[PDB]
């Protein structure tokens, strides 16, 4: 088939470049991978091509430009590559963490848009610099395609002022744009649209609450198909318990600890972002799988951390049920913990039965796959409970494709491929076949999509 | 009657001493008042004796000791005083803001207890110093009676670790006692016991949520008669919108503003505590009455502030309903806004009807008095809604009396006078008679107390 409608997506950190290559016309992920230790000694690419063994190559990358060059060379390599030449790529979608209130939707990057991103860089100091370096790097390597910014905060720009304002001097909002922004926008967008499909409803008629529980974790209250409130803040620090981030805390606590320790703002910022969360409580574990294993071994710090995560999730579900003003149609679990953390999901939902959330423990225990969307609520639960594995890369891919085509708009005026009842994820469909060979009962909880033919 | 069982209560700030004199055996408030501008030029006492016109006298008070001496001289004065001599006072109850996790209940002050308070002073740096100066001052003026500490954090010491731990390095808890403490303890204790009386239930069987909405504002989740969670934090800054405090905020926001402004921790701490909240949003108003009046005049900043307060209250009610694991027996509004802010109460409760909270707007509009406990929910509301005017001074009075007598203990093992169905507040009963002359329909919403004869 025609292989020339390929989209590259990139997510660049201070020392890494994650990539995916998507063939739009054949609806397939051709490859994904990561360059690690970018700007550091020992840079190394790990490249996973469809149907091939993992490929690993050490090659120095003192800059993000070297990392993008290494990706392209690997993708076009005759033996391990997946595209015939670099011109097979027709657009690049880049992750940008923070758009302030200057960006409500994805954009094609221009010099003026880059200047605008510089205005907001100070809102996302720990993330935007490397995202922008990645844009600048890829623009040099792939100069003849549109480079698009898909912005983690943009989904949340529908929040009303009563949700996004902090109770702070109004001049801090007016002069410094201090307000709640929220993150995980591509994940919430994707899972909100999938939830509408599963419910058989137009998005604008849906009222749902989504928990993206990954290493970073946040919740979104989706009222009439749009973000109404979300748990992260000006920055990704606020809200739920996370792997290394504190989430919610008395704003005066960091200042107290500073007076006790001598730490300065940047150090306190690092402690709250890199040494808190589950790692801080347990003293050693970031991954929820390690927390759960240690709890089962009797580790009281892990048991505490697990329970703190559960309790804060319960409180946020309660808060956002209140915020919705009505019973939600559904709650959604996504990201790694949402998809695999059956014990977290059980403990959260068992504490919410008086709010209409009734999990079925047998269904919940079966939902331990990234390859299927499932319903784990009891048949008669007032509120449906879905596990919807996310697909941030597909949002980035489709935004770049639609911007390149000229049809992209904000989601209240734009229709995504994955809003179709007949949308399929080819790689996940193949993985599900394998999952069902080993656990046939999983088939009984896969969602039944209205109108899917 | 015998007039010699008198208790003095004191609440000392950096420039003020508030006092009340309670005759225990005659169950009556003899006087209350305040010395203002203590330690400052123009110190002045305002003294309100039962049945008398307000008395105001300017008299220099360079120290809290001078302020306590002025109070005692005024109380024993032949024309404006209320007690024959200083030895009529048999105990003094002092407000202490912060007890850390070292104090779970009220105590008679000794030198060793004062040393222990010094260990925890750094947890309550903005409040404890003047509270302790007040103790030391009154011990010199009234050396022959017990001085008792009634501690705003103590009520909350029943919180379990899953509620009180922040997701921070465990060493910050272990070395610096960093955790959630909560405040308004005397108000929550009093109103929780009154709510149990009104419900006709033993306290240990009650599950209620209390909103103390004063200039400072916080909420308490009372599970099985004990604090389970509360909205203030390590310090009084966390949680609800307040007159000048921010409440909840991304912990990284103060550090961002610092980089934008040059402010240092103590200054940022002052901005978040003294220039935020309603004052920050509106730019000029602290009192909810001014916010509501300005909203009615069309002030968009006041309308925003009012709505932010309402919305955060809704979210906390939702969170604490979740935390309870069951429908609450009741929600309670108290303190000045809880007692008089009918518009806040209406807006909050109308957004919670799907959580069982059904206000009756006619009842709600009648509940604008400090002189009665009322029920403002619809007759068939799943969750009762009570307005219970608080009485922090009575808790302080009774704790001091019971400590002096030797019967005091933590509230799970001690019975207060106001747990009786037949408890009456004499001054409020007289004020209610006057309220009913002007608004007879108020009588229809006054609580009917089971077992009250």
Author numbering:
A (entry chain A), B (entry chain A): -3 to 449
Task: Give the text the authors published on this PDB structure.
We thus performed additional studies on the homologous enzyme (75% amino-acid sequence identity) from the oral pathogen Treponema vincentii, TV0924. This protein also exhibited acetate kinase activity, and it was amenable to structural and biophysical studies. Our structural and biophysical characterizations of TV0924 revealed that the protein has a homodimeric arrangement and a two-domain fold, both of which are similar to other known acetate kinases (and, more broadly, to other sugar kinases). Enzyme assays demonstrated that the protein has the ability to catalyze the substrate-level phosphorylation of ADP, forming ATP using acetyl-phosphate as the phosphate donor.
